[PDB]
Amino acid sequence: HHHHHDEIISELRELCLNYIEQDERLSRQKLNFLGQREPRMVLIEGLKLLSRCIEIDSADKSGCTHNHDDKSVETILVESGIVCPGLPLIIPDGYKLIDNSLILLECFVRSTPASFEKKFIEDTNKLACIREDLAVAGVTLVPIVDGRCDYDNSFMPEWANFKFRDLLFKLLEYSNQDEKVFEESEYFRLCESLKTTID
Amino acid sequence: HDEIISELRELCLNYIEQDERLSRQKLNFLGQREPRMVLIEGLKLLSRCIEIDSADKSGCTHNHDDKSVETILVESGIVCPGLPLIIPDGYKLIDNSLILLECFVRSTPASFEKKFIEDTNKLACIREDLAVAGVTLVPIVDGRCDYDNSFMPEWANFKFRDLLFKLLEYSNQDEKVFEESEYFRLCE
Ligand SMILES: [Mg+2]
Ligand SMILES: [Mg+2]
């Protein structure tokens, strides 16, 4: 056809344009993904695009607002006239305030039972350790941890999701040769000689 | 053809500032393959830039979702049914006054004045039914003479329009030199 890497990139863009549902909360990340032309960058922003699908998909199913702009909890409450300072820097995947209860959502994907459970406890405990600062605000914390075992989500048909991840794999397991060829360049050796001059 | 669609793609991606209000329209534009659709979305995209500048100059919110006056009010708690389907380029409900913004581009004084009166009458004919509901209409018509907007350098703005223009003149294909020579010759 062929499939030399620039055509992989091309097929990823067609998948993004033809088979990722046109939800406004993906517009920004779709645009950042379509804007890339270097292979490791296309790979990075493709992975970030697929993660936004899962996070937003999670926020919808959990009945709160996807944290579109990665606000902190302190920011979410400071945005609603509720002064709570002295709280960890926590950025939830979703949130929703009612009337004095604050739903906070963390979601994730793990592929083995051991890592699933371990991750579930970690995010449970991350949310639990601010329950009391919120109590003196005084707002009730409603922690939600949404663990998933795969990458299915409602903005991608399953076949396109799989083909997208499959092209991403070919893109990584290829640009894992361009950086290896890079380590024999000279510009690599000239980088190597660049640090010794500053460090 | 394709190199025109390709360099248009790169202007959109690299030389239109990444204000998120443009994101959706940029993406509809980037998804078009055929000249006709590239042209309409191209023009819509230039218009969105201009509407968004107007909203920002006029102190009101850009009508991103193409909401209706009907909708804008019910979202602020004003039940006022029976209004014609009017969809502004901008809006801002403020106390009990509804700022409605109509934004446009024209390039001759004659067609500028015409389109100005039209958008004036467009909003004015819902003034009374807003007064029934309490809200006083604040109608703003902002007409422009060109496509200058704050999201593109001027050279890019010109190159985009020059590229869209060549799609427009391409849509020709002689064609009319064979009209009756088979077409107007069917129900004959
Ligand atoms: Mg309009
Ligand atoms: Mg208008």
Residue numbers in the entry:
A (entry chain B): -4 to 194
B (entry chain A): 0 to 187
The authors write:
The endonuclease domain is at the N-terminus of the L protein, a multifunctional protein that includes the RNA-dependent RNA polymerase. The synthesis of mRNA in arenaviruses is a process that is primed by capped nucleotides that are ‘stolen’ from the cellular mRNA by the endonuclease domain in cooperation with other domains of the L protein. The L protein cleaves and snatches the native cellular mRNA cap structure through its endonuclease domain after ∼11 nucleotides, and uses it as a primer sequence for the RdRp domain of the L protein to synthesize the viral mRNA. The catalytic centre of the ENDO resides in the N-terminal part around Asp88 and should contain two Mg2+ (or Mn2+) ions, which are critical for the RNA-cleavage mechanism.
The crystal structure of the LCMV endonuclease domain (ENDO) was originally determined some time ago, but in this original structure the catalytic ions necessary to fully understand the mode of action of the endonuclease were missing. Therefore, for this structural study to be successful it was critical to search for new crystallization conditions that would allow the molecules to form ionic complexes. The present ENDO-WT structure clearly shows the two Mg2+ ions directly coordinated by the catalytic Asp88 and, through a network of water molecules, by Glu101 and Lys114. From our observation of 100 crystals during the screening and analysis of work performed on the Lassa virus endonuclease domain, this coordination event seems to be rare. On the other hand, if we compare these results with the structure of the Lassa virus endonuclease domain reported by Reguera et al., we can see that the coordination of the two Mn2+ ions involved the corresponding residues Asp89, Glu102 and Lys115, a residue from the asymmetric unit (Glu3) and no waters. Together, these data indicate that the affinity of the Arenaviridae endonuclease for its catalytic ions is low and that the metal-ion binding at the catalytic site is the result of a random event in the absence of an RNA substrate. In the ENDO-WT structure, the water molecules mimic the positions of the nonbridged O atoms of the RNA phosphodiester backbone involved in binding to the ions. Therefore, we propose that in the case of the LCMV endonuclease domain the RNA substrate is a necessary contributor to the formation of a transitioning ion-binding/catalytic site that allows a two-metal-ion catalytic mechanism (TMIC). Our data show that the presence of ions in the holo structure is in fact a rare event. The structures show that the metal-ion binding depends on the number of water molecules that are able to create a mesh of interaction around the ions. This suggests that the catalytic ions responsible for the two-metal-ion catalysis reaction are most likely brought in by the RNA substrate itself.
